[PDB]
């Protein structure tokens, strides 16, 4: 049981931006020894939006949605991820529901791209994703980019 919400960036508390920050710093930066600019600038401009999955004042689930218009004609998902002591719980197929539906809302039939590690390939095929681009590295970790509908 979760408190979920999206919010567009303009209307993030000084709270939320640290608290989905430090998150993504703790398991992109840190478990996963990767020392590369996890505050990439692309947080607090257009309508970049943010989907938080909260629970008694700790943030265990997060990931960033990019307008299209700022993005070629696509709704660009990344930044996926979930508090490593909420995993194995199935929050990644709670994640993916509701940022499908975030897109489809906010922007109603404007496909939606991803960076997939290369591996979890299948993973996203079932959500309907298909392969756009060769495989190519991401701190050395093959990934590949895949497109929706």
Do not use: N
């Not at 567009?8 to 398991?27: F, G, I, M, P, S």
């Not at 004609?73 to 940022?99: K, T």
């Amino acid at each position: 049981s979760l408190d979920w919400t999206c919010k567009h960036h303009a209307d993030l508390t000084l709270k939320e931006l640290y608290a989905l920050l430090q998150l993504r710093t703790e398991v992109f930066v840190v478990e996963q020894k990767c020392p590369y600019q996890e505050v990439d600038g692309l947080d607090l401009v257009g309508d970049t939006h943010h989907l938080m999955a909260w629970r008694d004042g700790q943030l265990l689930a997060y990931l960033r949605l990019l307008d299209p218009v700022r993005h070629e004609g696509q709704v660009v998902i990344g930044r996926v991820v979930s508090s490593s002591a909420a995993r194995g719980q199935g929050l990644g197929h709670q994640l993916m529901e509701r940022a499908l539906q975030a897109a489809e809302r906010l922007w109603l039939d404007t496909p939606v791209y991803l960076s997939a590690q290369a591996h979890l390939q299948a993973y996203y095929g079932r959500y309907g994703f298909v392969a756009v681009t060769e495989v190519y590295l991401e701190d050395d970790i093959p990934h590949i980019g895949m497109r929706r509908a």
